[PDB]
């Protein structure tokens, strides 16, 4: 009863020390360059905790959703840009996994649950960026084939990533929300290119690229899900991603909050280890407590997910903004409490604050999501 | 997982009802003119729920801790004052139950169950609060039975409730925390008194006395637990009775977002419902996240609770001060959100902000839960 | 420079000692009974801060807006529902001061810069009441005069007021704020009368109760400035009262540091933390209060914007300090034995009355994006 | 007309003169100060050729000799553009107080003229590796070496170091302490490794090592023994330059996320449009503005030197840097992925902002003076 099973604490300890081991000295050097985390990929890998989510019929770990954000957690704790890894394959995958076609799942799904490929997963663009119901990349039919046109941003894992499940307008005049559909895009594809790697604040490693449709033609079996469903997918996407979000989030504080401690029972100034003074204390209390508070919602909204129960929007949502929110507040103030040493790069505190923004930022601005809470509310 | 069982989930149902027309409209008179909540009291024992906690062995409910927590919190949701009728049963009964001794257990709880007699618990000190194994309240053994004297002061029912589970040293010089020993106290022993109650803020309708002890012959079996070991028993309790404060807190914060939630979406101002507002949406929605992590943190920690956990101190802390704290927030923003009507006791919401203040203050102030926290953050 | 001149700190001495010892010991019991503080009406009028704003002009102490609202926060340090009085008085004379011809302020300001009569002000409406644009209190003229029909709410001071300045519409076309004007109605005067005080949070003891018009006939040198302007002149005086709610909120959260302070000496680092916060924010609040104070005396462009920004900010920071104050004293704290819990309380409605501090959160934002 | 609480007119004839300083010759460079972590040559250079280098010198010495409002002032407008650059007024008045509040005419004279006409930059040598907060207990020995003294030990966190080019540091004379001008050239003066940190990347945080510096007897700076008297009080009047450092960044970050939410659309309606966004720009403005006012108040507080000087300096330091702090992560959240990405500034006035609330006194040590400036 509102606890893990002890199996994700097996899973927790596995990840954990996967996280410990390849992936931490791989985070500092990850975010100085802002090139990939690839030793965590392939440590990730190795331990078929790269992906998870994906179901057994595909080589897929099987794991419940708490248990995926679980892993998103314990990599986030060390390293945000790592810990996108299996989150943004969950998030590439799920309108694949949620609405593909039994053969375009059968197609897909197994080479990530096998490693082969990472997912992306293009529905923002640059003039509609959380307006996603009015977006511009265009599939037009060609053939059996779809002909993409347009512009995906903010794109996680971009240029490392396969497979790019994009969404595209199949009907410009049709009801809103029932003109998109989902195409798996290839690397391979002519036409499909990348932007620039962003300059970016935190997540400095896992690439965010936009990406560019040039009359990208592609066969009709990409197709994933219906014709038109692409927004209805796209939802359950959110609702269901989202939590990965928060999840990373209490990760990012997680990592933050252990280098807090730490420091505070080293140190001392004035004579005393910084941990004793009860200022201090309340400090890491609040940190703890809410970090505690956020972990505990993404979970139920985990727990909401895999149960695909009704309020998956709310939760999702106020697990991710809460989530996020409380990184930013938690990590600043692990930067806070390291003093001098948490504003210098040698510390992960510094990394892990520039890290912990975007969870309020990407997939949803929290204020998209505080516009979804309230939508949810007014029922 | 992170479910409150479809048990539990009836449980909150029923008490939800019985709350809803019981108990809520009394409890704007409960709490103007000071009044014990009879009508909660008597609805709930009608219904067991005025102290499901209680052992199935002696006629209660056997309502698992996470049960109990929903209770306090559906009936504090429309009376905080009436939560305390469970909460303040289950905190007084708890030293009865973790060591009492089987008879005395079985002559107190069957009182309780059925709803005859009411407890409270008598462990604070006017004097030294926060530092109990200083306390002054003393019990001489004197043939079979002893002689108490001294102060237990801030003690939430007292006048109403019957039996009183109060801790004396019993050692001037025993050890430390081993020199304390528990007492059931009745509303009959001579010497005996209560001070006048006190013009409390919030939570007005439940009594809270001053204990006087002027050499109050009490038996020896109104011992429970071994002599000494009381403290420890004692600091269990608090462990456990601070998650029930704590969803006392979030049943506050619910009945003051509720309420809000109701007059946001049909009064209106400039001539749209003020809930099209997207920042009366921002703050509503923040209300409901604060909120529900509070509650989703009251579970875990109730869940805590029952497994008797090792972090259950902290996690119990921890969704004390973060439930309370949020309640605050929450009950501040609805007095907000209601304006010059919210200011008006006309609407509940302004007592509700009244009272998830002393839910940060009794039952441990958050600071003394900010202390316990980064305490067992500093292992 | 950036600090009281030495004559309002003269001013702060002298109010602090008229609200500690004549004001203080009452605030308990004003606000216990919910009743109006007597004891400090009679005392701020013997010491000439019942509304030191008037103009000399009238008998008045001719104190400026800083001067005014440090009165309002020595009060409201000791008794938010007494800090009111000068405060409403202020409120209620500012559109009879700011747009009034010398006839109708020679009438009024005398009587309440002497203290016979206390000002409330008619503006807020049960139906339209951040809406004040759009409001339903009708006066159409009847000869030279004008009647009224209609309901002012949330009138503070009201039930013992003698003198109303009351804005009513009095031409439904045109644009709405610019077709609303106000006039001065008396509580003898025939037909208007009062709801029940309201049942209030905190500030129990300055009654807070509607006002009914029922055809009250009000002459027609009550005009309050050219008709039709009264939208102007409204949130010409909300400008100016702002800050004096930023003022208040600084006083009751001043009140709640000094007991919680207090307290702190009388029975660790982290309650001085606390402590720090509290008093840095309210410090903020203050000096944000006294910077808009000053804004509004030599009428700045942004008055708008620094009223709203001192108003909210302050009462913001009163709510979480009284909150805080509760706190540091504990159990003591949520007993009315102490005044923190009806400081706590009294804080509360500053995010409130006089523009929710969602409202001024807009006006500011409005001036953000002109 | 009455000038109270508010900045004077000339104040503000500096600022509009501050602000087209920063802009046209401070501001294009902030970018690549911070993206290189390269000190602002070029904001020095117009600092400089602008009477902005430490315009709180006296008059005597050839400064505009700049009240601290005036002297604030510029640090914010410097700040609101490039926190890096407004270090320059900001560290040069941290390691000039010493001099100032206690050092001799001599000693004055020496140094002072050299910062004012723009030559030279100071740095300010107080905390260490083991007693940074606890200036009583550091173990940077200052021995009497006949008239002149030799210097051991190891000073930290410096700001503009082995870039400034007097560091008066300041070490114990019997274990206490003393003040003194340690030149960039003085024999065996060296600097540690630089900082790379997460924001003022441009003005450099080096370690300052000393293995047997002499020095001169004249580079002493007060009272032998009693620099403490004047450390108290270089911290009591420098705070509300840090927390004007705030003010400026967080003016600066509330800026441009204005810009973003004005000339961008979401949803079809302006961004800004979205009464969401709107509270959040006015909950920015007003704190900001708040700390912007005790900034203002707690420098006029340091010019006059008032007995609470203590708190509302450590406040309006503590208080403006916590509030950039907060104004910067909603002024990145408000450009979104936009305002994520270094191509907008918003970005680096966050991790600028984040500095402010922890040098030269964690906010928590500012608090700490807060709380014993309470219980007076």
């Given at each position: 009863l509102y606890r893990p099973t002890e199996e994700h604490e097996a899973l927790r300890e596995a990840i954990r020390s996967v996280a410990e081991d390849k992936?931490?000295?791989?985070?500092?050097?990850?975010?100085?360059?802002?090139?990939?985390?690839?030793?965590?990929?392939?440590?990730?890998?190795?331990?078929?905790?790269?992906?998870?989510?994906?179901?057994?019929?595909?080589?897929?770990?099987?794991?419940?959703?708490?248990?995926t954000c679980i892993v998103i957690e314990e990599i986030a704790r060390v390293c945000a840009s790592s810990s996108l890894i299996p989150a943004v394959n969950k998030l590439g995958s799920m309108p694949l996994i949620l609405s593909g076609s039994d053969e375009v799942k059968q197609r897909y799904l197994p080479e990530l649950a096998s490693g082969?490929?990472?997912?992306?997963?293009?529905?923002?663009?640059?003039?509609?960026?959380?307006?996603?119901?009015?977006?511009?990349?265009?599939?037009?039919?060609?053939?059996?084939?779809?002909?993409?046109?347009?512009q995906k941003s903010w794109i996680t894992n971009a240029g490392i990533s396969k497979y790019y499940?994009?969404?595209?307008?199949?009907?410009?005049?049709?009801?809103?929300?029932?003109?998109?559909?989902?195409?798996?895009?290839?690397?391979?594809?002519?036409?499909?290119?990348?932007?620039?790697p962003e300059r970016k604040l935190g997540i400095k490693g896992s690439?965010?690229?936009?990406?560019?449709?040039?009359?990208?033609?592609?066969?009709?079996?990409?197709?994933?899900?219906?014709?038109?469903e692409g927004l209805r997918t796209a939802l359950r996407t959110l609702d269901h991603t989202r939590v990965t979000i928060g999840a990373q989030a209490v990760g990012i504080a997680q990592g933050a909050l252990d280098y807090a401690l730490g420091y505070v029972k080293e140190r001392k100034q004035f004579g005393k280890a910084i941990a004793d003074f009860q200022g201090i204390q309340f400090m890491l209390a609040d940190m703890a407590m809410k970090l505690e508070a956020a972990r505990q919602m993404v979970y139920v909204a985990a727990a909401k997910s895999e149960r695909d129960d009704a309020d998956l929007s709310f939760y999702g949502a106020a697990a991710k903004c809460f989530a996020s929110d409380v990184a930013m507040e938690i990590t600043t103030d692990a930067v806070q409490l390291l003093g001098g040493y948490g504003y210098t790069r040698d510390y992960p505190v510094e990394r892990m604050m520039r890290d912990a923004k975007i969870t309020q930022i990407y997939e949803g601005t929290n204020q998209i999501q505080r516009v979804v809470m309230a939508r949810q509310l007014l029922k």
């Amino acid at each position: 009863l509102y606890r893990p099973t002890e199996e994700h604490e097996a899973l927790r300890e596995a990840i954990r020390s996967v996280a410990e081991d390849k992936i931490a000295p791989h985070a500092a050097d990850v975010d100085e360059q802002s090139r990939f985390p690839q030793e965590a990929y392939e440590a990730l890998r190795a331990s078929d905790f790269h992906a998870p989510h994906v179901a057994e019929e595909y080589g897929g770990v099987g794991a419940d959703a708490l248990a995926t954000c679980i892993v998103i957690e314990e990599i986030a704790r060390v390293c945000a840009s790592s810990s996108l890894i299996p989150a943004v394959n969950k998030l590439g995958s799920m309108p694949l996994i949620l609405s593909g076609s039994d053969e375009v799942k059968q197609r897909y799904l197994p080479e990530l649950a096998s490693g082969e490929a990472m997912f992306s997963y293009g529905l923002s663009e640059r003039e509609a960026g959380s307006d996603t119901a009015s977006m511009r990349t265009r599939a037009v039919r060609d053939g059996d084939d779809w002909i993409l046109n347009g512009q995906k941003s903010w794109i996680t894992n971009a240029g490392i990533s396969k497979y790019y499940t994009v969404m595209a307008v199949t009907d410009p005049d049709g009801p809103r929300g029932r003109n998109i559909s989902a195409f798996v895009v290839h690397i391979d594809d002519p036409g499909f290119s990348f932007g620039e790697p962003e300059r970016k604040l935190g997540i400095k490693g896992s690439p965010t690229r936009e990406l560019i449709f040039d009359n990208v033609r592609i066969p009709g079996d990409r197709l994933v899900g219906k014709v038109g469903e692409g927004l209805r997918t796209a939802l359950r996407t959110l609702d269901h991603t989202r939590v990965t979000i928060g999840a990373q989030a209490v990760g990012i504080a997680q990592g933050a909050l252990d280098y807090a401690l730490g420091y505070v029972k080293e140190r001392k100034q004035f004579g005393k280890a910084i941990a004793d003074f009860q200022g201090i204390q309340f400090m890491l209390a609040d940190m703890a407590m809410k970090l505690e508070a956020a972990r505990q919602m993404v979970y139920v909204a985990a727990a909401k997910s895999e149960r695909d129960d009704a309020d998956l929007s709310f939760y999702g949502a106020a697990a991710k903004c809460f989530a996020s929110d409380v990184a930013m507040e938690i990590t600043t103030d692990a930067v806070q409490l390291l003093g001098g040493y948490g504003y210098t790069r040698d510390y992960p505190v510094e990394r892990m604050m520039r890290d912990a923004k975007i969870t309020q930022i990407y997939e949803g601005t929290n204020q998209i999501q505080r516009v979804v809470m309230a939508r949810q509310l007014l029922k």
